[PDB]
């Protein structure tokens, strides 16, 4: 259950989750997922990044879920479930802005 994930934010808004990912503290690839502000069904995953050109910032990438099943961002890289799209992209960058690293402080 993904509720059961700490990663698991639910229901807080765009930018609640970034009041909580633009801390100084926050390492490259901090994240969360929350159910999306706008669209039924589909979640977002909010990444901290950091650059010399924008400085710490935040993305939002929307994670979409099919009836049929399978959870993705790109429907060409799919999964079988939310955790398991999670570790995938612990391990690699892919198109994030940065593989996710840790869950995001309260
Ligand atoms: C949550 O569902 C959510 C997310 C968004 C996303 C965007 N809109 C805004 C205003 O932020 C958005 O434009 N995000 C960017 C993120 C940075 C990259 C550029 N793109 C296109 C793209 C996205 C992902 C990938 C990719 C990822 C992993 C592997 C392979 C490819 C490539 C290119 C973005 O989409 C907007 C609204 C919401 C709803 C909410 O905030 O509540």
Redesign the pocket.
Known sequence: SIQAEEWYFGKI??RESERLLLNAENPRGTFLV?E????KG???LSVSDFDNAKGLNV?????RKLDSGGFY??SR?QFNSLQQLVAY?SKHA????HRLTTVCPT
């Open positions: 808004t765009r929350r999306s502000e706008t669209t589909a979640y977002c993305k939002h990438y929307k994670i961002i790109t890289t992209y892919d198109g994030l802005c």
